[PDB]
Amino acid sequence: LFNTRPKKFGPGSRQCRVCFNRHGMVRKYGLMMCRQCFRERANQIGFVKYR
Amino acid sequence: KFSLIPKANRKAIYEYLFKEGVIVVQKNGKIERHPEVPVPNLHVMMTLRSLQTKKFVEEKFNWQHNYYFLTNEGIEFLRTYLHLPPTVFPSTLT
Amino acid sequence: EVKDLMTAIRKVLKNALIHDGLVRGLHEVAKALDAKKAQVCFLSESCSEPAYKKLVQGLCKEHGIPLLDVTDSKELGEWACVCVTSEALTFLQNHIKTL
Amino acid sequence: QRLHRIRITLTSKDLKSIERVCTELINGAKEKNLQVAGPVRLPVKTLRITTRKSPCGEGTNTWDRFELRIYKRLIDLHSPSDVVKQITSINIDPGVEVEVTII
Amino acid sequence: VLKFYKVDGNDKVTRLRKECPREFMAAHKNRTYCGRCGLTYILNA
């Protein structure tokens, strides 16, 4: 009637939980993390970069 | 969903907050009513937009999810509306 | 005073709004009458509309449940047209059914 | 009691957290002297994400190479289930997911 | 506002717009239609 399309798939369906942003959405292993959001909190999750 | 929440379902928000003393609501408007209390999710956001701006409840954000605490003057208000016996729910009690 | 001259109105209409069963308006009182609902009703001593005054009495005449009287058309509802779906009611209850 | 066979999974992020558990629970078995085999070290499932460092497009297109590491390790036993509950319940570690399994 | 019936004295009050209720009707032409009923109701005449 109003205020809803079919919203099931594509970038419009889903957003970053931390900052509410669709762009740059890391969905590997079911993160649902926007990249700007993901890199700074990556050490606190577990991810430690080397080589 | 949409429109003003019934006045029975106003007390459905308050009587949950009267017993437990916590109520957290997801920021999203189109999201399903919050797990726990069977109402629209917008109506929980509207009633605690209403509550915070007359003090009583202590709002605290992070993470879209809005983690409310209920103060000493807050438990006076609900009891009056609720009609609950005085000293009914101390947070000091376990 | 020695006991209390008609506080059976004012005590009950406060405490009934715990359970929420007071009904207000000409539509909703008429719907409460046209129902398996309304247990006591009220009107003004003087309101207006012979039919309006008569209708309240008339509606009751079908399915029972009486009126009384009270006082002042402004100061009817302020103790809470009224509808109501021991302790306080002991003064009213013996007047309503018995004489 | 009955002749059973138990093979307990161990997983965590740290190496140092499991090397406590592998040393402790075999010595905890050797209190009672059950039929222990040594801890079977499976291959390491290294998880990987590569994002860009910059928020916007500017500069040279540089990249992080983030990594987790996960360490599946398996203590083998042949013993009934009532015996093992004493060994596992004492000495639980911080942030180490452990699940006991018959067969 | 529910005054619009054929009102009478001593002591009956006859009604207008005969209802067909789901579990008073509007009247323009042919159909009868109930306001409060959440599913909308149609019967021509």
Features:
part of a larger assembly, 5 chains, B: 94 residues, mainly alpha, Arc Repressor Mutant, subunit A, 3-stranded antiparallel β-sheet, globular, E: 45 residues, little secondary structure, 2 strands, 9% strand, elongated, ribosome, Toxoplasma gondii ribosome, rRNA, rprotein
Can you tell me about this structure?
It is classed as ribosome. Keywords: Toxoplasma gondii ribosome, rRNA, rprotein, ribosome. The entry is titled "Small subunit of Toxoplasma gondii ribosome". This is part of a larger assembly, with chains A (51 residues), B (94 residues), C (99 residues), D (103 residues) and E (45 residues). Helix content of chain A is 20%, strand content 8%. Chain A has 51 residues and is an alpha+beta fold. Chain A has a single domain, classed as Ribosomal Protein S14/S29 (30s Ribosomal Protein S14, Chain N, Irregular). In chain A, a hairpin with a 6-residue loop joins strand 1 and strand 2. Chain B has one domain: Arc Repressor Mutant, subunit A, CATH 1.10.10.10. Chain B has a three-stranded antiparallel beta sheet with strand order 1-3-2. The longest helix of chain B has 14 residues, at 7-20. Chain B starts with 6 loop residues before the first helix and ends in a 12-residue tail after the last helix. Chain E has one domain (1-45). Chain E is elongated and about 40 Å long. In chain E, 0% of the residues lie in helices and 9% in strands. Chain E contains no helices and two strands. The chains are: A alpha+beta (51), B mainly alpha (94), C mainly alpha (99), D alpha+beta (103), E little secondary structure (45). The interface between A and D is medium-sized, with 15 and 12 residues.
Spatial arrangement of strands, main beta sheet of chain D: 2-5-1-6
Please report the total strand number of chain D as a whole number: 6
Number of separate helices of chain D: 2
Number of strands of chain A: 2
Q: In angstroms, what is the radius of gyration of chain D?
A: 19 Å
PDB class: ribosome
Keywords: Toxoplasma gondii ribosome, rRNA, rprotein, ribosome
Entry title: Small subunit of Toxoplasma gondii ribosome
Chain A: Ribosomal protein uS14
Q: Helices, strands, pairings?
A:
This is part of a larger assembly, with chains A (51 residues), B (94 residues), C (99 residues), D (103 residues) and E (45 residues).
Chain B: H1 7-20, E1 22-24, H2 41-52, E2 57-58, E3 67-70, H3 72-82
Antiparallel strand pairs in B: 1-3, 2-3
Helix pairs in contact in B: 1-3
Chain C: H1 8-19, E1 22-23, H2 26-33, E2 40-42, H3 50-63, E3 82-84, H4 90-96
Antiparallel strand pairs in C: 1-3, 2-3
Chain E: E1 25-26, E2 33-34
Antiparallel strand pairs in E: 1-2
